[PDB]
Amino acid sequence: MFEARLVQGSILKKVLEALKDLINEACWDISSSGVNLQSMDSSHVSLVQLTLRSEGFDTYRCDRNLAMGVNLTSMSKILKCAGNEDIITLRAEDNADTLALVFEAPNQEKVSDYEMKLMDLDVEQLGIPEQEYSCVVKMPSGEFARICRDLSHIGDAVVISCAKDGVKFSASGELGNGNIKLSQTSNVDKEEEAVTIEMNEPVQLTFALRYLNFFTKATPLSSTVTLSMSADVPLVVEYKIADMGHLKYYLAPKIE
């Protein structure tokens, strides 16, 4: 009942490269308004809110609401078959035991049909309020992935402190402590280098950093990371796709 032809394989490939190792199985919720995934980590600390809107899919139809529970390692190994410019057609028919991924080459020569088996899955959904956030930093995505990769060598935790002079990612461990400080570049506000700090209250929160390294595998999806955080609320790492939806990553802080 569900058909979804999307003209570029890069978006779904980068989504499943983002989700192949943070979470290991998930249940996609597919309606006529788009394809959502409010999946919950087995470590019980991270949430994924993936939304690919129906206007993003360039040929989209869905007769009824349908939830399919896939193992995303298998879905990532099957979307690894597609290239970076293939057209991916998602198909799911009545009594959906398999999901058909069709990879059409842009030169109209190679068609690759993949009938991935599904499984019975029951993933609980969590309640996300539309809430105002105290500190919202917009960052280059390669820059934030670089910061997480740098601080992962130092320690197992990061202390993000947001203030009017900038954001400061601190890390303490056996090696020492590193403080990557970033100023809000108001003069250079281009597409890539766009560090903008919406400021309501100075916050200082300690997060884990292995889960931030899992989050920063979503870095080829977009060039902007929106880290939104309040004083005790879990932070949101939003990878705002210019085409379709978002990939929000919710991570709980560490409390002393």
């Binding site: 249940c27 087995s42 300690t206 879990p234 709980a252």
Partner: protein, 351 residues
Amino acid sequence: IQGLAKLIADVAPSAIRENDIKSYFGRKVAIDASMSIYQFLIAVRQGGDVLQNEEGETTSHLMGMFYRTIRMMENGIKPVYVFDGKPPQLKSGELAKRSERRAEAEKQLQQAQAAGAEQEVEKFTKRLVKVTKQHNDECKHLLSLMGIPYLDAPSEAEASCAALVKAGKVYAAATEDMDCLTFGSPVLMRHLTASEAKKLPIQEFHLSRILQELGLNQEQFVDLCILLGSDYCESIRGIGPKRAVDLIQKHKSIEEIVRRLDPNKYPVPENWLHKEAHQLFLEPEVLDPESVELKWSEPNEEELIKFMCGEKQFSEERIRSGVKRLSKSRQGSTQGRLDDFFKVTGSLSSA
């Protein structure tokens, strides 16, 4: 409980989560001590030796749970080693039966060392194991110097682990047996080891998901574990686990199934103790959970060198590095949980 884990794996596999050791990072988990003592006095044999010191005092269990508790703080899991005390009287025959099984092993020991085949000597050295008040007091002394909280149960400590989970103090019980799911614990750990990260992954059993996916409550789950084989009382001969679920899912209590089942097909045992076993599995003589407070303290350094390595004549660099790893892992920020912040407004099943 004989075959409950295989039954849950066959029937309702969504109630078992195959979680990793490192994913939790700050979860309070009660541990049955005596099962870990038996694991660390069976597996830590090199062979014909006991792995004891030069004076003969057995100390393999101390170093085993030393390294296991160190790796549980390293992975973040804060343990509560609940120790076994006086067992209930319905087990008091059966444990005695278990002891005469060891006496049979004692009998087979004169086909072990008399012939000289060392493999059977190792295989029955692993079966003449017995916990002792010396072993329990040595391990309680060790956990006194770690600062890990130890609880001496006034009854069977599986029920006390289920009481500590049911009070909301600890999240889960680390007992590998399926007694704690019958005793009433919502979340149960299994294979909570240290080094076997992927050879034995953590099998988290949710009793709420078991009772949801089997259409049961605690009463007929206790009755279910009576029919399919219970440690406390005897079970009916003609009913295994598949007949247990097929005859608890169609009749709820145990009074209705002891009336209408004929003695010609499935005869009841002549000494029925299912009501007393149901009372001991529903309302055990557990400790008061709020009377005890769980505090994790920093490990005393030189006292742990004096007890752990002094009269046990071990090394110093290895144990000192382990205590340094415990002090590094304990002193830190406790990781928050996402269930505390976002409320579960619903559940989604793959349809």
